[PDB]
Amino acid sequence: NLDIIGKRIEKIKQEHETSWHYDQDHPYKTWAYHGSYETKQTASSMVNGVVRLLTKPWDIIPMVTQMAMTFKEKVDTRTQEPKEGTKKLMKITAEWLWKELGKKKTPRMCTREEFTRKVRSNAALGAIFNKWKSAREAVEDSGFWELVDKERNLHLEGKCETCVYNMMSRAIWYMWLGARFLEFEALGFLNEDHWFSRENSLSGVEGEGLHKLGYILRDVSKKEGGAMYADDTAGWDTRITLEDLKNEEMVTNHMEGEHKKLAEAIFKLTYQNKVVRVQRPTTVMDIISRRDQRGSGQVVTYGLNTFTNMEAQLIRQMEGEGVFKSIQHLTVTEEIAVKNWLVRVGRERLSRMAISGDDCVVKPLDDRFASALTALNDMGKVRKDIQQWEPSRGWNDWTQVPFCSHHFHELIMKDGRVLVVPCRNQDELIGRARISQGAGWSLRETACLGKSYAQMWSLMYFHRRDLRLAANAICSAVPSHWVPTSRTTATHEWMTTEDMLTVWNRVWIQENPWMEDKTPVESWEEIPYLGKREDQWCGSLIGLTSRATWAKNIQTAINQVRSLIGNEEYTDYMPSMKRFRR
């Protein structure tokens, strides 16, 4: 308790000595409260005018237009301690899983150079504003690194002074760049060296790309077994127990020297003990603390969520297969059975799963898995939108399974070759491309973000009639040499000024390990669409009068945007489509 968090609390107390009151009407039950102090401040979603002017039919579709307008009583709940049997299953599984992930990888510190290079090409590191303006400036200043140095030596000494969370079914925990650096130095290797690649972790999909996920789910479907299960957890980050954080910390057992000590400090001082500052309109700042739940950087959060989800799903698989009888207590002979199961079939069972942080697909040995709920519920990983003891409903067809906000279609090219393509409701895709985040966007920067969405659509969603047409229109409306941009950056192959037909050939043919015939495609007309009825099912406006008028008059929309941007060099991409080709 206060021996580990006091120093952080003490330091904040003194910087607001004018305002420090132990408020009596504090709304916290599950968070430890410590005091308040005076502040006054808040970043709404802005519309992308280039994308909206080229998607006129969607101006009267509420599912699109409502997306641009506008639970923290789930962060303030508690999770019960798992039973002894459950704690044993988790410890055995976690020990085995770090060893498997460690067989072909070496833990190592990430460098100031790697961190500096990240900041100097806009990765969402979740930092705050203040002594330097931006991340780019602090990183190019020796003073910062001396603050970093002071904290670093405090961590080597087993103590913390400045590693404090700022809070803002979501919740992002920003830290100061320094605390983020020290987290990246100790634990960045999990992402930087691809510990959760499919090659390394067998269940993972880190670095795979949306053009691979469908083929991965089809490969899982080919295993003998029961239905495909895709159960969502209700508020995964809030269900991470102190036992989970201790099993995650066992990655330090594989480390040595300075690295081991720096990593043990991140786990002990920032993950297993947290200090957080939260805005309350009653506007004050509350300084609250707790031991459990997930609150790390978003990239470390991804890897540790993937780890703990892989662990939880192996245990649910063990329950279904009858490897243990009860979570109350593991007998000596059940422990050896669980160890033996892991050694003999553990790697096969990992290959039955696709796991992306809190998101999973499992094809178990049989459907006993559906009603194997005791360990899953006792670990606190309670399923969303189903009663606690109601058996899971599985999917009979891999093309219906939800994963990473998508489903996947099997699409046969006129030449017989097979594409497995990503898909989601088209209102969601159009609504997202019509939104920007943040202030000070020039017309050029707005155009270049629209171009990033257009090129993503050409590469991932070419099979949706409306998106191939809208992508061609946006790429015709934005100057040909202007470079696509994002502000918060899976593999992003559409972020390029290379010709999109050349990129399509590289991604779907040349580098596609599921495509045996490497014959390049010569034009966009060789590249197929979904069935017309399937395209409508997934939200196409094909068949509507609004959509017909838009398609017919598209050159008028393109010319409106070109007139706003001004006298620049543009390319007409519309004749790449049969209907504009004379």
Ligand SMILES: CNC(=O)c1cnc(C)s1
């Ligand atoms: C006596 N039970 C066991 O040792 C195992 C159960 N399932 C395995 C693959 S090994």
Ligand SMILES: [Zn+2]
């Ligand atoms: Zn610290």
Ligand SMILES: [Zn+2]
């Ligand atoms: Zn679809």
